[PDB]
């Protein structure tokens, strides 16, 4: 991804967009009960904690475009992945407007909580004023589609979340590029059934994990994997994607029956954004806008890994590459050992910056003991080995419980953390509950005990 130009929105006919400048994150009742070092990400250039230009820092993710066209290794990757998806017999017909709005099997309804994007954000009109879940009315939407059309600018928001001290000082805040409601709706009508098929088929055929339930999915993953695991992290995955990867994605779509609307991918590839009082054009780079976003990033990840394996290991048997991606995150395998360091080297030529799995200093062998997916380790249950626990380290949970975005959601927030934490074992879990109950807010919460969660887990299979 590369920003082509940036200038005052007024100069191109667009209004200034208002964006909050104060985080909703504040110390929780457990701020001093647990250890943590993360704090709210910088949201404005005037933040006292800054140690460098904010604007420059947030847009520095657009490192450029390393490639222009789709080479032969990419075309082969496209053929192999498309052929694989062909086995799913994905319904290729457009999804009706109602279902695209209020959902259907395999696709949840539009989030009435998120931004409606342009021009609604500037007209003060909100999703709640357009959508009606009780009636599933499409009249208001349809009228809005006819009026403002599609391919509208994406509204950029700084993401209000916790970040390390270094990232705060370096102004490395992540961005949200919200597509207009018109585009989200249009995109879901065009690819709704594709999204549904992926959501319903997490695994090594879709090569995707979007819509998965870790508590149940972890027990299924080991079986789908080949003998030798391999993995790596990406630095700024979304923004680093070159236009060629979007073209390769369109080829896949064309081959599986959606050649009909590959034009929608162009909107993601060559896109224009609104940020505050500025507008800019980006060539390449996946906008972080929705579940559609994550599915396409996942499909591209499948194309990337296949491409690097073909370029690095001529004669590789892609039919034995077993991988599952969630956006840029991935867990992969092959019958033979591969060199992640080599793959990373080939990756640079395709515009991808690949580093050792889980922040390792060097590229080390990935095993069932040290591998992580969605920040979770894999651990066989002590009593029933065939049941696999998704284990997220307590460190992350501790960091999260120390802050709140709304005192009214304390119960939900803490329960959600408990569902993640108990997998660390009964001893650790009880210590967690005892600390929570060391303050009045914690004592008033209705939280599940260990045996209750374990029984609930067994009963969910």
Q: Give strand pairing partners of 389.
A: 379
Q: Pick out the residues of the known binding site.
A: 233, 328
CB of 242 to Na ion, least distance (A): 10
For Na ion, give the closer residue by CB, 271 or 404: 271
CB of 1 to Na ion, least distance (A): 6
CA distance 30 to 32: 5
- Cβ atoms of 172 and 51 closer than 8 Å: no
One DSSP character per residue, 45-99 reads TT-TT--S-HHHHHHTT-------S--HHHHHHHHHHHHHHHTT----SPPPHHH
CB of 154 to Na ion, least distance (A): 9
Q: Pick out the residues of the known binding site for Mg(2+).
A: 233, 328
CA distance 197 to 256: 13
Interacting residues toward Na ion by CB under 5 A: 271, 282, 285
CA angle 409/413/417 to nearest 5° reads: 170
CA distance 266 to 253: 13
- Cβ atoms of 156 and 179 closer than 8 Å: no
For Na ion, give the closer residue by CB, 285 or 347: 285
Q: Give strand pairing partners of 308.
A: none
CB of 270 to Na ion, least distance (A): 6
For Na ion, give the closer residue by CB, 253 or 282: 282
For Na ion, give the closer residue by CB, 154 or 325: 154
CB of 271 to Na ion, least distance (A): 4
For Na ion, give the closer residue by CB, 40 or 285: 285
- Cβ atoms of 43 and 21 closer than 8 Å: yes
What distance, in Å, lies between the first and last C-alpha atoms of the chain?
A: 43
Phi, psi of 167 (to 5 degrees): -65, -25
CB of 63 to Na ion, least distance (A): 13
For Na ion, give the closer residue by CB, 269 or 400: 269
Q: Which residues contact 13 (CB under 8 A, 6 or more apart)?
A: none
């Amino acid at each position: 991804g590369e920003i082509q130009w940036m200038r005052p929105s007024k100069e191109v006919g667009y209004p200034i967009i208002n964006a909050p400048s104060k985080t909703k994150l504040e110390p929780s009742a457990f701020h001093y009960v647990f250890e943590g070092v993360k704090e709210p990400a910088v949201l404005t250039k005037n933040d006292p904690r800054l140690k460098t230009d904010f604007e420059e820092a947030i847009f520095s993710k657009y490192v450029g475009n390393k490639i222009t066209e789709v080479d032969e290794y990419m075309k082969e990757a496209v053929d192999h992945y498309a052929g694989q998806l062909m086995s799913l017999d994905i319904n290729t017909e457009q999804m009706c407007l109602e279902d695209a709005m209020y959902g259907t099997d395999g696709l949840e309804a539009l989030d009435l909580s998120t931004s409606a994007g342009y021009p609604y954000v500037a007209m003060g009109k909100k999703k709640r004023d357009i959508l009606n879940k009780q009636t599933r009315d499409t009249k208001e939407m349809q009228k809005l589609l006819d009026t403002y059309g599609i391919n509208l600018p994406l509204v950029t928001y700084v993401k209000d979340e916790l970040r390390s001290k270094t990232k705060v000082e370096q102004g490395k805040s992540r961005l949200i590029e919200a597509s207009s409601l018109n585009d989200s709706v249009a995109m879901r009508m065009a690819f709704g059934n594709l999204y549904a098929a992926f959501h319903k088929n997490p695994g090594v055929i879709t090569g995707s994990a979007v819509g998965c339930d870790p508590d149940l999915f972890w027990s299924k993953i080991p079986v789908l994997m080949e003998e030798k695991l391999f993995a790596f992290d990406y630095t700024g995955y979304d923004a680093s994607l070159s236009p060629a990867w979007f073209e390769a994605l369109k080829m896949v779509l064309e081959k599986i029956g959606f050649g009909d609307r590959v034009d929608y991918i162009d909107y993601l590839n060559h896109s224009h954004h609104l940020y505050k009082n500025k507008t800019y054009c980006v060539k390449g780079g996946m906008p972080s806008a929705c579940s559609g976003t994550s599915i396409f990033n996942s499909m591209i990840n499948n194309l990337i890994i296949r491409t690097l394996l073909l370029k690095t290991y001529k004669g590789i048997d892609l039919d034995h590459l077993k991988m599952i991606a969630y956006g840029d995150d991935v867990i992969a395998s092959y019958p033979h050992e591969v060199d992640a360091s080599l793959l990373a080297q080939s990756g640079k030529d395709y515009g991808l910056t690949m580093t050792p799995a889980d922040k390792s200093a060097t590229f080390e062998t990935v095993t069932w003991e040290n591998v992580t997916f969605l920040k979770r380790f894999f651990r066989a249950d002590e009593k029933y080995p065939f049941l696999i626990h998704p284990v997220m380290p307590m460190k992350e949970i501790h960091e999260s419980i120390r802050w709140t975005k709304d005192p009214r959601n304390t119960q939900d927030h803490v329960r959600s953390l408990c569902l993640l934490a108990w997998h660390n074992g009964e001893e650790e879990y009880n210590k967690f509950l005892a600390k929570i109950r060391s303050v009045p807010i914690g004592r008033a919460l209705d939280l599940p005990e260990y045996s209750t969660l374990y029984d609930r887990w067994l009963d969910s299979f």
